Structure 1
Amino acid sequence: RDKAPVQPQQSPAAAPGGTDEKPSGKERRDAGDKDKEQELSEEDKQLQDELYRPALEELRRQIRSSTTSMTSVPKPLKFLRPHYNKRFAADIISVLAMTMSGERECLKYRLVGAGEVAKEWQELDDAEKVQREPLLTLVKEIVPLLMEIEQVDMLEKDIDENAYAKVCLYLTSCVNYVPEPENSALLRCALGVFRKFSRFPEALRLALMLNDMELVEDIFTSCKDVVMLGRHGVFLELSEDVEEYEDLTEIMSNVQLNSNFLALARELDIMEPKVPDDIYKTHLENNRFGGSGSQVDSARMNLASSFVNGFVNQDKLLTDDGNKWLYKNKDHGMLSAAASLGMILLWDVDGGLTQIDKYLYSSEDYIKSGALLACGIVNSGVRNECDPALALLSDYVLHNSNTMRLGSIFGLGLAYNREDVLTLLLPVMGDSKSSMEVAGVTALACGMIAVGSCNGDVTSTILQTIMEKSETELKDTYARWLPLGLGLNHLGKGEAIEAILAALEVVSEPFRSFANTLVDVCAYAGSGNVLKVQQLLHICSEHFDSKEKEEDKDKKEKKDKDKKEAPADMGAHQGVAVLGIALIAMGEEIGAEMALRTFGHLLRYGEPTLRRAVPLALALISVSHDADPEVSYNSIFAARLAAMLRQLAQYHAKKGTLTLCPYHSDRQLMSQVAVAGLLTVLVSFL
């Protein structure tokens, strides 16, 4: 109404005028006021004019919070000692304590790095646990300092709203916006709220991020005491990495309390539900073995038939199509066909034994070496094939045990901090045979053995292979496939300064500097590090045309979650190598129309490197639009490389390290055909 009678009431500094003028402002404070508090010019004298001081400070913070301010608002609150669903408390708590506590917690967050913000933040904790605004009191209480049990002090009744909402948006913003040191508080405090509550599988994801044995032990006794099982066994073994399944198998090798954790959770039981169900509910037609088995010629379409047969495992007709199919192909086809029968038998240990035993101790080198490779692929927990393979590897100059070292060490590395096989691979690293694939499957073997190490390791094994790598700067393929195993050993770091150590000792001529930038590829697994985005755009114009391929190829691994930022204008440039960086950086996800849209322009190219590289990611990111793009490949094409690869994509057209290693090691296909002997035994498929 009219402010004429009540306007000059606040001007007299008399105590009665305050003790009756202030209760009027408290009465009219239910909706704030009739206006935006234009009386600042008449209350700026009462600003400094102070028994009943909390009411004058309350009105002062009310008007200063009403019109505008940035620091002077929460001071009457911290000095006031606050005392004394409607609209009054909902406003002055919700929005006035929202902006008020927001600017106080922010100014105290960036100002000092006292219990005022703690006790007052707990008072707001209770007040907002009474008002119960979802995801807003949370989204504002994200950055408030404490990062402690306060969540369990709030997680009493609202479990699905705080878990689903708070863990959803705070996990997405905790992997995209919030850095790692607070993400550790998400892992431990989420270990608390989810350990004390239900919904075990999300705590199992907290074990996918923590990689600790106490979480899986507590969830195996808490999940063991409450009695389906096969499903969480399946994604239990799928979700667990190389560390916590051997630590898990050592604590369960200690007690396990059930005989079902070793007996059930030891081996063959993640595949024991898969094979018979896939044979029963699904049935593949014979037109794939008929066509892809009928247009084989030129010793390369037969290699495509070794890809189809090699990765087929319902039907096993081409396997039992007599003999001489292995002899008609080349040596790499002898390895591919010798390893196909081992890759199709990830079940029936006795059957795989009685099927691969024939190729063992044969007369040819690649039949027995691919036979030991098959023995390494058929199983991953039997480890009884170690002695016959490793017993003969000590030759050091030239023998069949070098190819048997390729297959034996590669398959044995796929089967698995194992110290015995690594100390036996130390003379292999010291040997440095002319065949690069020796150190290839050795460095990749021990690398995949050592993925997920806590903050990496600076041990004398990889330090020794770094010294031997610096010994002679020849055969750069060593400087390409050795940083693979090095970076795989550096995998699992959380705060390792090993990348800076490599930036101290390793920095040399651009070969070992390319090894250093490979360590940089295995050094940015993901956090809030926009400095690497602006530094990435600053380094995008480097003269060296390979560290851009790998360091920029890391894009698909770093931002693999937030896919909205991945599409850019990299294709519109002239650096076709960058077009391959995006072409590989597409990924293996559900394959939105934007990715296939990039495959539309990337598909048509003249060089066989990009034309050969496009169908791999094209059919990996789309695994039912599979037939029309292949017709497009037939319209563009109609050399032998594009034909073998186009039949390969004809076959396979239809966050674990085991599925990330094979293609990252497959990023070196633009070389001799020797890689095709290892291309057929990739483990990235299921």
Structure 2
Amino acid sequence: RDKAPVQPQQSPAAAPGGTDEKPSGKERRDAGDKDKEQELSEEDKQLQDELYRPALEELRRQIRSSTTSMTSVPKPLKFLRPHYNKRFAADIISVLAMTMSGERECLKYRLVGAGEVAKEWQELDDAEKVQREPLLTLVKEIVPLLMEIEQVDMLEKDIDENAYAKVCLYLTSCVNYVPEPENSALLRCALGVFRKFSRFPEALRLALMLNDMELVEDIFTSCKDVVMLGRHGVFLELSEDVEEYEDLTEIMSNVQLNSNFLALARELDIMEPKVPDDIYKTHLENNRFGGSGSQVDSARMNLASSFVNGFVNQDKLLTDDGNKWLYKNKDHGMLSAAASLGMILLWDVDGGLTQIDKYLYSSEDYIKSGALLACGIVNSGVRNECDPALALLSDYVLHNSNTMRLGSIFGLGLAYNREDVLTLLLPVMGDSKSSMEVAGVTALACGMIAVGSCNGDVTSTILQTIMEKSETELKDTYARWLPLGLGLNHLGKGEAIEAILAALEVVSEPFRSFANTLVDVCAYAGSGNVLKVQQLLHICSEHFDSKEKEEDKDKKEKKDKDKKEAPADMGAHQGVAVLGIALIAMGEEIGAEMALRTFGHLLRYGEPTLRRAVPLALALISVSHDADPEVSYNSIFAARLAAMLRQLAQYHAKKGTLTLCPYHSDRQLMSQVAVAGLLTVLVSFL
């Protein structure tokens, strides 16, 4: 209708004209007006004017919110004391109260840091619980505990919509953009609403991110009350970290209520059903053992054959193909081949003793040391082979129990804050043998033992290895693999002060500064810390040619979830190892067409470091299109490292720390063949 009779009604200041003109504006407010509310130029004089003043404030905030206003909108509502499923209610409530309380919660949440914003925010909470528009008013009310009482106040009937949708996209966006102190509220409030509701495995993911000991007991009495079993045992034992499986094995060593929580909590029930399931449903051909086991020569392709053999566990023909195969190999090949019988037998705990006992206490030191390493690899919960190896330990110069210390401390570290082995590891780190792998498997052993701690620790373990690290600035490989275990102990995020303490005491000559940037690598598991991205771009142009490799190599760990941003322009640079930084930054994912697109360019290189580094990620990222890149390797090559590693890819073709540590420690393969004894015992390969 025309505004001729009703337009001059707002000009006089008569009280009856207001008390009847304003209800007319409430009646015609369902569609607003005939136009975009161009009456502000005529009704703007009523700002200084004030019986039914809440209706005048409602009209004022209605028109000021109608045309334009950024701060003056919610003031008439916070002073109005609002009083007195329809189209009108959806109009003035849904979008006008959504944006209204959105900018009120934004301006008040970002300005000061009262009850008005709580009453308005809960009023919008209930009004939008009636309107039932999901994830929109939620995604607007994310940044303004309030979210705790909001979720427990809303999560009554809708379970899979808010849980699946809100927890899915708000979990991905929460770990992507939302900072950590609010993600902890997502974990505790999600522990509440998910503890009171069904779908336990997502609360088990909340136990993976929380690393709490009560959640596994509540999910064991709640999963025990509501009874498949072997599956949640599989991803239960695989999902749990180093802390809650020993705390779990001690509280279940206490009561356990069924003997099935330690029956499952021990490394017997996640592995006893796999043997018949793997042997029955799968049937592997023998042409890989015959061919790939036939074109091996030069004592290095035979090492690749000990790799293919060791990482086979159906068929056990190449495992027992005669003798002298271990005798013809080299010393480090006697270590890897001696551990091969342990890598092929991560099953059948009863027969492991009568199968590995043949090489025990033999005439050769590497056979018995790799045999104790085999005993450490075959199992992880037996812990009955410690005494005959860890007992004596008295060498002090060179004796066999140092290599048996490699296999037994490394294998026991894979089997495992237990002091029953660290008190014996104190003279190990205090010995400082010239052999690098001693402090290698010792620092990595205590590191993998110390992952998952409560905000880490700055005790005399890392303090002792730092004082003894800086004691002698020789054989910088120690200054390279010691920061591995240091950064492993730096786990325990939640704004711990270990990075600041290391930034205060560790800052020295660029070796311990390389240790410091390694602490910066392991200290950024992931959060909203874009300062690490602008700092990454700022420090990316450093003259030091190793902190670019490790610090820039951290890209595959920091943004490992949002893989849409992982491909970058690192290939267009001119650094000597930046193509290796992106090549390793590819990783072990499903291997989309973009990844193989990067391997098409990274595959053709002249240096043996990139040509040797490309088949590992090329075959790990793809587990009639798998062997074709290997044929491309045959077209490129047809040295020894490229052939042994290309066969390693020939068999490799077909946030847990256990899957993040081995390759990050493997980033120092460009050294002597002594590391090749540790190259084949990587535990991250499933």
Aligned mates of 1:658, 1:542 — CA distance in 2: 31
Q: How far is the alpha carbon of 1:332 from its aligned partner?
A: 1.4
Q: How far is the alpha carbon of 1:451 from its aligned partner?
A: 0.7
- In the alignment, is the contact (CA less than 8 A) between 1:615 and 1:645 conserved in 2? yes
Q: How far is the alpha carbon of 1:119 from its aligned partner?
A: 1.4
- In the alignment, is the contact (CA less than 8 A) between 1:179 and 1:528 conserved in 2? yes
Q: Deviations over 1:632-676 (max 9, x none)?
A: 000010011101011110011123111111111110001111110
Q: How far is the alpha carbon of 1:267 from its aligned partner?
A: 1.8
Aligned mates of 2:620, 2:33 — CA distance in 1: 63
- In the alignment, is the contact (CA less than 8 A) between 2:396 and 2:431 conserved in 1? yes
Aligned mates of 2:203, 2:364 — CA distance in 1: 51
- In the alignment, is the contact (CA less than 8 A) between 2:98 and 2:124 conserved in 1? no
Paired position in structure 1 for 2:92: 92
- In the alignment, is the contact (CA less than 8 A) between 2:105 and 2:117 conserved in 1? yes
Partner SS state of residue 571, structure 2: coil
Aligned mates of 2:592, 2:296 — CA distance in 1: 33
Q: How far is the alpha carbon of 1:85 from its aligned partner?
A: 2.8
- In the alignment, is the contact (CA less than 8 A) between 1:454 and 1:494 conserved in 2? no
- In the alignment, is the contact (CA less than 8 A) between 1:456 and 1:490 conserved in 2? yes
Range moving further from structure 2, 338-347 or 612-621: 338-347
Aligned mates of 1:340, 1:169 — CA distance in 2: 44
Q: Flag structure 2 segments of 5+ consecutive residues without an equivalent.
A: none
Range moving further from structure 2, 612-621 or 255-264: 255-264
Q: Deviations over 1:439-464 (max 9, x none)?
A: 00011011101111111100011101
Q: How far is the alpha carbon of 1:63 from its aligned partner?
A: 0.2
Q: How far is the alpha carbon of 1:149 from its aligned partner?
A: 2.4
Q: How does 1:60-79 map to 2 (within 5 A)?
A: 60-79=60-79
Partner SS state of residue 469, structure 2: helix
- In the alignment, is the contact (CA less than 8 A) between 1:296 and 1:302 conserved in 2? yes
TM-score (norm 2): 0.99
Q: Deviations over 1:88-127 (max 9, x none)?
A: 0001011100110110000001110111111111111110
Aligned mates of 2:433, 2:483 — CA distance in 1: 18
- In the alignment, is the contact (CA less than 8 A) between 2:85 and 2:130 conserved in 1? no
Aligned mates of 1:394, 1:517 — CA distance in 2: 36
Number of residue pairs matched by the alignment: 686
Partner SS state of residue 45, structure 1: helix
Partner SS state of residue 12, structure 2: coil
Q: How far is the alpha carbon of 1:492 from its aligned partner?
A: 2.4
Q: How far is the alpha carbon of 1:265 from its aligned partner?
A: 2.5
Give the direction of change, closer, same or farther, for the CA distance of 1:666–1:138 in structure 2 (3 Å limit): same
Q: How far is the alpha carbon of 1:493 from its aligned partner?
A: 2.3
- In the alignment, is the contact (CA less than 8 A) between 1:301 and 1:647 conserved in 2? yes
Aligned mates of 1:218, 1:429 — CA distance in 2: 40
Q: Deviations over 1:366-420 (max 9, x none)?
A: 0000000000001100111111111121221110111111111111110001111
Range moving further from structure 2, 620-629 or 151-160: 620-629
Range moving further from structure 2, 34-43 or 266-275: 266-275
Aligned mates of 1:254, 1:149 — CA distance in 2: 36
Aligned mates of 2:413, 2:289 — CA distance in 1: 31
Q: Deviations over 1:346-382 (max 9, x none)?
A: 1111211101001001010100000000000011001
- In the alignment, is the contact (CA less than 8 A) between 1:109 and 1:145 conserved in 2? no
Q: How far is the alpha carbon of 1:145 from its aligned partner?
A: 7.1
Q: How far is the alpha carbon of 1:147 from its aligned partner?
A: 3.1
- In the alignment, is the contact (CA less than 8 A) between 1:417 and 1:449 conserved in 2? yes
Aligned mates of 2:576, 2:43 — CA distance in 1: 69
Q: How far is the alpha carbon of 1:624 from its aligned partner?
A: 6.1
Q: Deviations over 1:527-573 (max 9, x none)?
A: 00001101111111000010010011010000000011111111011
Aligned mates of 1:315, 1:327 — CA distance in 2: 23
Aligned mates of 1:559, 1:271 — CA distance in 2: 32
Range moving further from structure 2, 210-219 or 143-152: 143-152
Q: How far is the alpha carbon of 1:47 from its aligned partner?
A: 2.0
- In the alignment, is the contact (CA less than 8 A) between 2:506 and 2:512 conserved in 1? yes
Q: How far is the alpha carbon of 1:54 from its aligned partner?
A: 1.0
- In the alignment, is the contact (CA less than 8 A) between 1:453 and 1:493 conserved in 2? no
TM-score (norm 1): 0.99
Range moving further from structure 2, 437-446 or 271-280: 271-280
Partner SS state of residue 651, structure 2: helix
- In the alignment, is the contact (CA less than 8 A) between 1:612 and 1:642 conserved in 2? yes
* Percent identical residues: 100
Aligned mates of 1:150, 1:70 — CA distance in 2: 26
Range moving further from structure 2, 265-274 or 57-66: 265-274
Aligned mates of 1:131, 1:626 — CA distance in 2: 52
Partner SS state of residue 571, structure 1: helix
Aligned structure 1 segments of 4 or more residues deviating by more than 4 angstroms = none
Aligned mates of 2:438, 2:471 — CA distance in 1: 18
Question: What is the CA RMSD across the aligned residues, in angstroms?
Answer: 0.9
- In the alignment, is the contact (CA less than 8 A) between 1:175 and 1:527 conserved in 2? yes
Give the direction of change, closer, same or farther, for the CA distance of 1:145–1:375 in structure 2 (3 Å limit): closer
- In the alignment, is the contact (CA less than 8 A) between 2:245 and 2:265 conserved in 1? no
- In the alignment, is the contact (CA less than 8 A) between 1:452 and 1:493 conserved in 2? no
Q: Deviations over 1:314-350 (max 9, x none)?
A: 1110121111000011111111111111111111112
- In the alignment, is the contact (CA less than 8 A) between 1:624 and 1:654 conserved in 2? no
Aligned mates of 2:624, 2:6 — CA distance in 1: 76
